[PDB]
Amino acid sequence: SSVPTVKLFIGGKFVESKSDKWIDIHNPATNEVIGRVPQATKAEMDAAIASCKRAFPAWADTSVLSRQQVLLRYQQLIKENLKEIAKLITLEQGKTLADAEGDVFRGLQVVEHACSVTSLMMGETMPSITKDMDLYSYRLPLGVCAGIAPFNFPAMIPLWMFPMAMVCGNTFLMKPSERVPGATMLLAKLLQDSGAPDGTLNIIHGQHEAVNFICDHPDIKAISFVGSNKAGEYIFERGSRHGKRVQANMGAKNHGVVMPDANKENTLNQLVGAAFGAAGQRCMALSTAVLVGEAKKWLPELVEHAKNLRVNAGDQPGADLGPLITPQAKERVCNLIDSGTKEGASILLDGRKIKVKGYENGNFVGPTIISNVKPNMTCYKEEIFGPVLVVLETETLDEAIQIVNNNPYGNRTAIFTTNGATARKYAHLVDVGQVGVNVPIPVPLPMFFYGKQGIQFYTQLKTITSQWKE
Amino acid sequence: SSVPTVKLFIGGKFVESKSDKWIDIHNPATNEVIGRVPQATKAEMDAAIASCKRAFPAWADTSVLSRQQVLLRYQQLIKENLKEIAKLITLEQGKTLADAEGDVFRGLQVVEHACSVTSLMMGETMPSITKDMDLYSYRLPLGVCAGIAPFNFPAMIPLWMFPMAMVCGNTFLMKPSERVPGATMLLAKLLQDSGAPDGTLNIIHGQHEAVNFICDHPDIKAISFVGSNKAGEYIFERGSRHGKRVQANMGAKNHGVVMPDANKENTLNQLVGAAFGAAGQRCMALSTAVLVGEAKKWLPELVEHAKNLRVNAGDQPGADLGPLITPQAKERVCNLIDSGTKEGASILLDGRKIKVKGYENGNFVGPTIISNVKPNMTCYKEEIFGPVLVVLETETLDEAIQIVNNNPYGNRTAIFTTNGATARKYAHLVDVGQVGVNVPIPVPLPMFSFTGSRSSFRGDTNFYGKQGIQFYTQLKTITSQWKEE
Amino acid sequence: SSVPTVKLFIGGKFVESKSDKWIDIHNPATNEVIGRVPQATKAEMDAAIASCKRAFPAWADTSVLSRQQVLLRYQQLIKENLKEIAKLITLEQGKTLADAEGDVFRGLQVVEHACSVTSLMLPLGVCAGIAPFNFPAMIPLWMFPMAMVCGNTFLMKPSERVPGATMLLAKLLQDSGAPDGTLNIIHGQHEAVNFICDHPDIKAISFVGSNKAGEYIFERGSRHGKRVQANMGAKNHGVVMPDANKENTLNQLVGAAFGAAGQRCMALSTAVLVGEAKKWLPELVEHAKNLRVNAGDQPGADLGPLITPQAKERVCNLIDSGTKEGASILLDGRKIKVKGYENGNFVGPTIISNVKPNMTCYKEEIFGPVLVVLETETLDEAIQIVNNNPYGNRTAIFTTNGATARKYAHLVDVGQVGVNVPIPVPLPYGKQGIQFYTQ
Amino acid sequence: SSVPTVKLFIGGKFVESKSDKWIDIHNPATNEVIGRVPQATKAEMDAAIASCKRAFPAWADTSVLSRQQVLLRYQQLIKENLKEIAKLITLEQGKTLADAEGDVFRGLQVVEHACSVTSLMMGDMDLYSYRLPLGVCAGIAPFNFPAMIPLWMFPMAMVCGNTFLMKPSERVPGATMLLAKLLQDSGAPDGTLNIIHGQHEAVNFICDHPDIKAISFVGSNKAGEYIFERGSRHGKRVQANMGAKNHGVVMPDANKENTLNQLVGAAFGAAGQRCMALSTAVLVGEAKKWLPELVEHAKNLRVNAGDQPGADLGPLITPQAKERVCNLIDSGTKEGASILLDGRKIKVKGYENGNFVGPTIISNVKPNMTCYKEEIFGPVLVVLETETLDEAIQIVNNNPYGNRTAIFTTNGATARKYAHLVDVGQVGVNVPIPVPLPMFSYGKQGIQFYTQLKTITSQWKEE
Secondary structure, eight states: OOSOBOOOBBTTBOOOOOOSOEEEEEOTTTOOEEEEEEOOOHHHHHHHHHHHHHHHHHHHHSOHHHHHHHHHHHHHHHHHTHHHHHHHHHHHTOOOHHHHHHHHHHHHHHHHHHHTTTTTTOEEEEEEEETTEEEEEEEEEOSEEEEEOSSSOTTHHHHHHHHHHHHTTOEEEEEOOSSOOHHHHHHHHHHHHTTOOTTSEEEOOOSHHHHHHHHHOTTEEEEEEESOHHHHHHHHHHHHHTTOEEEEEOOOEEEEEEOSSSOHHHHHHHHHHHHHGGGGOSSSEEEEEEEEGGGGGGHHHHHHHHHTOOBOOTTSSSOSBOOOSSHHHHHHHHHHHHHHHHTTOEEEEOOTTOOOTTOTTSOOOOOEEEESOOTTSHHHHSOOOSSEEEEEEESSHHHHHHHHHHOSSOOEEEEEOSOHHHHHHHHHHSOOSEEEESOSSSSOSSOOOOTHHHHHHHEEEEEEEEOOOO | OOOOBOOEEETTEEEOOOOSOEEEEEETTTTEEEEEEEOOOHHHHHHHHHHHHHHHHHHHHSOHHHHHHHHHHHHHHHHHSHHHHHHHHHHHTOOOHHHHHHHHHHHHHHHHHHTTOHHHHSEEEEEEEETTEEEEEEEEEOOEEEEEOOSSOTTHHHHHHHHHHHHTTOEEEEEOOTTSOHHHHHHHHHHHHTTOOTTSEEEOOOSSHHHHHHHHOTTEEEEEEESOHHHHHHHHHHHHTTTOEEEEEOOOOOEEEEOSSSOHHHHHHHHHHHHHGGGGOOTTOOOEEEEEGGGGGGHHHHHHHHHHSOBOOTTSTTOOBOOOSSHHHHHHHHHHHHHHHHTTOEEEEOOTTOOOTTOTTSOOOOOEEEEEEOTTSHHHHSOOOSSEEEEEEESSHHHHHHHHHHOSSOSOEEEEOSOHHHHHHHHHHSSOSOEEESOSSOOOOTTSOOOOOSTTEESSSOSSSHHHHHHHEEEEEEEEOOOOO | OOOOBOOEEETTEEEOOOOSOEEEEEOTTTOOEEEEEEOOOHHHHHHHHHHHHHHHHHHHHSOHHHHHHHHHHHHHHHHHTHHHHHHHHHHHHOOOHHHHHHHHHHHHHHHHHHHTOSOOOOBOSEEEEEOOTTOTTHHHHHHHHHHHHTTOEEEEEOOTTOOHHHHHHHHHHHHTTOOTTSEEEOOOSHHHHHHHHHOTTEEEEEEEEOHHHHHHHHHHHHHHTOEEOOEEOOEEEEEEOTTSOHHHHHHHHHHHHHGGGGOSSSOOOEEEEEGGGGGGHHHHHHHHHHOOBOOTTSSSOSBOOOSSHHHHHHHHHHHHHHHHHTOEEEEOOTTOOOTTOTTSOOOOOEEEESOOTTSHHHHSOOOSSEEEEEEESSHHHHHHHHHHOSSEEEEEEEOSBHHHHHHHHHHOOOSEEEETSSSOSOOOOOHHHHHHHBO | OOOOBOOEEETTEEEOOOOSOEEEEEOTTTOOEEEEEEOOOHHHHHHHHHHHHHHHHHHHHSOHHHHHHHHHHHHHHHHHTHHHHHHHHHHHTOOOHHHHHHHHHHHHHHHHHHHTTTTTTTOOOEEOOEEEEOSEEEEEOOSSOOOSOHHHHHHHHHHTTOEEEEEOOTTSOHHHHHHHHHHHHTTOOTTSEEEOOOSHHHHHHHHHOSSEEEEEEEEOHHHHHHHHHHHHHTTOEEEEEEOOOOEEEEOTTSOHHHHHHHHHHHHSGGGGOSTTOOOEEEEEGGGGGGHHHHHHHHHHOOBOOTTSSSOSBOOOSSHHHHHHHHHHHHHHHHTTOEEEEOOTTOOOTTOTTSOOOOOEEEESOOTTSHHHHSOOOSSEEEEEEESSHHHHHHHHHHSSOOSEEEEEOSBHHHHHHHHHHOOOSEEEESOSSSOOSSOOOOHHHHHHHSEEEEOOEEOOOOO
16 A cells, blocks of 8 residues: 555566665655655566577567557557556646646547558568579567666657667667656556567566666667656767767757737747646746747747746646656756846746645746847756746847757747748748647657667668679 | 661661561651561561570579669660760650650659669568478569550650669660661660660560560560550450450540649640640540539630640750651541530630641640530540540539549549648549649659559550569569478 | 258358259268258348448448457457367368468468558458368458458358368357458359359459369459459479488478478479489378378367368379379379278379379379479479479479579579479468458 | 979969968879979968858859750860869879879769759749759868869869859868869850868868858768768768778689689789778688789789889878878787788889879788778778678678678679678679679759758648
């Protein structure tokens, strides 16, 4: 009853860990312990690796269609248990039920995209490129893969890391978030129910020690990560040290540009939705707003629209944003807001002293709007990972483009304007690949990895050149 | 007596034929004999077949990249010599300069499409479908191919036949139209200048005997033909009885439904242009249309728009309607007009009596309009291949759809209407997949195959697209289990 | 007492035929009447076609995902009833339980292949299927699932001699949530094929097996203007090089040549021992003798009895003609006697050698457990012999040398060449099948 | 009188460098100074970068079809002046006329391949897939021995719409100058291509300069790693097409004569100064008995200047290469290995002062010897032996770096087993060099490298 343990998943059994280190799973809305996740031991991780290795050959020999049937049945089962996963997410991570449903829906979309890989697995051939010389190439699995998610999306991150590696024929060793592993456990249960061969998927919970193990052990051929730039680069280097390939989303510091010729109502609505959605904990979200020209006059309207947000627990009906993941995150956000205020920034809206009825012991932080910010301020450089919207002011679109380009870590950007020529100019001049015209977050799916990129990453390309004569 | 003859293309080099039988080349604007074409003898055809066979191995060993580079050089030379080809077409076939330009442009687009067959020639593979079981897929050239073009397109059909057959590794033995061969000879000269190895393309002439030889000769692996229904069926039969694959795009009496909720003036202009453009000689011409409800009130406007066409030789400025290719075509058109008259159809406008100033010697026929037609009229059964616009009496969309379905031979159909639900219902019940909205004739789009299986087409495969590759190549699948314990 | 009567499938319910032409079906292992099949009347076939027409709109409007889920549930139901289907096929067709399980496995494979039709575009309409007695389970799962998932309603006419397997399959399909009237099944003789070809309601027809029957069906379809993908059968020529694995090659030959009593649509019934490979005839005969001939349900059996006594008579007549014409019979099974099943249509493994290409056995389709062996001195002669075959769909080459296999695959005119493996790609259709069932 | 001086190519104008530091170009057949290459000054490199920047807008605005026609005209010009390029190559690098012609033909084929980028470059919520060029590209050439490579780098970067700053081999510039002249004659806009010469300083500038967007390098692994690190440090996207040692496995059932001929041609071909050379051979099973015939075939090779008729392999580019090869062979000799054929004492008649090294065959070599670890880049073939295919596969896998590998055998089962169990990407069956093209994993990968994808998502409406 008390402090319910979180079991592991090795081979085909939900074996429980006997480790010494244990971490408590707190509800972000009440700080009440709802579970205890163990830090997997060296022996348990070795057993998981052995299971992955033993399952690798059988799963690889399995035809691509046979594997894809498993993913199809797994997607169907997920669709059947949508409400259960949504409620588990709302309970553990604290996000609203609608946010969890949307996350599971994006995960289903990614699973379908992976199921659609069956055609890409075929290789090309060129008969008789020269006299009696044939050419053809093969795509084969790499080996044992792994994934890491410190505190980000609990379901979508696995639902994009693991299904692709499976469809490619590899075995996956997932290290889910130490704070929200229940969703991953339910997903693994639904998978095992889908008829997946035992040992194809293994799950081990652990702290930085587990990440170091995964990076050091050689049997891991590839590793995937999504999170802060620091941990991203750290894992990338630790993997490259051992030769194994690694891919990581290191930053999502998106900049939103608002031109004077834009729909004020819809623009402000989308800005408030993307900036404070999911309490700003989501990696991809408009956090830096650039007002060009007379757009500065919309600051009072922006603050008014932000005041209309309803802070409440993820389970209470009529909620717009949930509490933060941990009290430490709230303290960090408060310290960052205090630093911004000390550096001369004006706090148009302050949520540090928010008090939710019936959940005062939760990690809630109200919508925070910071204006008069400059590129040299901490609020601009540091990634908040919270419901804080920093606003900068510029006179021409060239200044906004330059500010956006100065951002070293940036993958998604948006511009709000009705002039198509202005949008095209911004897209051509901006140094960001993904651009959103009147869209807050283009391609909300986790990516820099999909389509051709995912296959090229999770499969090696063998090339055979044979010239038989006699 | 010996009017300047036209060159042949044997052994990858322009040479003359030793035949004693010649066919006169008449300018349709003046019926002047501008040239003569001799039917290739058995010797010339045998030499062409031998050269194609000799070139087949080298042209197949020739990497697809080099073939596509040659096709690109040919595209470039066409783009440079566009005006010469247009002049040749206008002089020989008689169509206006604009029609020749459009023909050359469509041929250039088809060449560009053929240049992108890179991913199509390559095969698929799937290693280890089971324990030690590798599957391979290869597409190999067939051999020497033959092509018979109609009298309508001395450029478009040759430019359909050359790019695909050549890029697929096959050597082609082309047969142009005896009434318009010069344009094809100039196109072949440009192709040879583009770097085409000698022997990959060969040109012969002959009305019926050459077709019989091509269909009977065993070295011909495949045959491509475009023309009438009876001729296409005869060619298909003569080819299949010898074991050779044949594809024939035969007559296609496309129908255009005129809905009351459409652009009136624009729809009428498009109908007038399609039914009378290039003297309506196009086999794919929109010679028939359906007037639904209010569309029938516009017949006076049809007559007005028809009278607005500048009936003049194709070389004069502003010419809209050209002359008939030969006096026999004009005779057939006039006989069909007389038959429509006898059947009781209302010929609202008759261009049978119109003549062109300064070109009365030409086989000119003005824009003719026949309205109040129903499936009972014989002119609806037969195709005019001339400047005759047929419009039928109809009351509802379902009746028009049924009338169009009653047409046994038709490859394309269109409907003029701004209502989306109307076009949806039309496409759902009409027996045609190539449906166009507010367009008289769906323009070819070679990136996919020109699908057709009605009485207007013979053969299980089509000319270009995926089906084009399937036709000009042979699919071989190899399953290998290399294991020795 | 009263032999069971197989009912038709119309409007989503099993209904008994009103016709009096109740043909009797015998078990091939005992030639005992296990049931009767009626020749559907004109009225019953018209009602089935009308039901298919009325059901086509709803099934076509159904989303592709719903049809895919239906096919997945049907595959699941088959997996749950694989044993029953295999036992029914063995009792009705005579082949061994292993062969029936393999047929069900190929059915599952083709269903999974059809599941990949997520989106490629429209359905034509009423589709028809004509299946011979070669494969009761596979042929339906070859034809009707594709047309179904593509949005078309299918009218299946199974083999008159083995309707039970497809009837249980259709029952399981209806259990999978298939809308009523989507799939219709009728029975009848040549008259049924004549109706299906004449009735303009049918827009597409699928047929396999006999060559002349397929030609007739294609001609009738072209006469009535219907899409007919008549994939007629063809002989398969296997070439054995001296450097090939003797044991493995002989095992493959014995399995493919005599497997399922050689009644399958395509089998490696011809072997060309080029070079010193001819010296392997003793081992081949010994391996053929090791085969066990017994009822499909008795443990320890490799090949079952023939479909009907007429098939046995025809096979015996062909073997006698080959012997009289000059061919030497290395192994004779015409007078085999299975213990407890002497009345069956059993025919022991037969091996014929010294057969020239112009002989009857080489030209005629045996459709039985007979293996004709030819000899040559160079691979070019074998390639020429294989190319001379007008109707050749599959060919195999056994060799450990890569250059030899590559030369054989390149010089041979056959489209499908299986190197070191017999009966390559036993499934053929595919995306061309989608094009066929669509417009 | 004085030796000719190589001149830079900036802004479409062949300009002589005003630098003080100069480097001499020696004929590898006689070591005679035939030319001088200058050390590009900071100002000249800045001017070249400025020219590339000013030319990038116009060259990017041009449609892909115009660039394709330019590449076609350049290919035609190359086909016309193939003999001159071959002569210059044989003069500067020492390769035989046939080898130089083959190099020119491979470059022509790579240009033809690059021409096939016509459509691949083009690439309520709308989703565009525009692909745009990066900007000013750069390409450092080998720091050991060259072999084509300009036609690998600049044609693709240009047809993709980018401007290129080419750093040719300081030891064989003339070919690059002739190619640049032909390109300028092909109608290429001035400033689209710029060429500067220099030592390590030039590489440091190219890697550190901010305007450079991408860099491409071929050659040894050390310089490759250095350039990759220095580029990634400044945010540069770089692909290090590093060379690697190749391993060819021979089975007892392989074609004896053909296998020996192909081995002798791939190992001692072009003096072994190629990253594609099959510098090592593994004789599995009874294949060991083929050593005498291999030595005889190696002896049959005739060593002579690249211009003299009847030459199979030419001399080394510099005497330092000969010294390094001699030191590496002496190391293997001291380490216990045996030399079946000694080429150190080769003395070409009439060219005794050239950098010639005859065919060398080393046997009994183990994986721990320097000959196996170090890249010889010379006419040296180390022959190993094993008793089973598993040992050869394990030896091939143990090698850290590798791009090409070959298996000589007639049994398809053995070939497939080797191809599947081997950890190398390109596997050749009865072929020493599986693909003499710039794969070094440029095709679709090159298209993706020289272009940046932008998935413009828009909810724009008439409002």
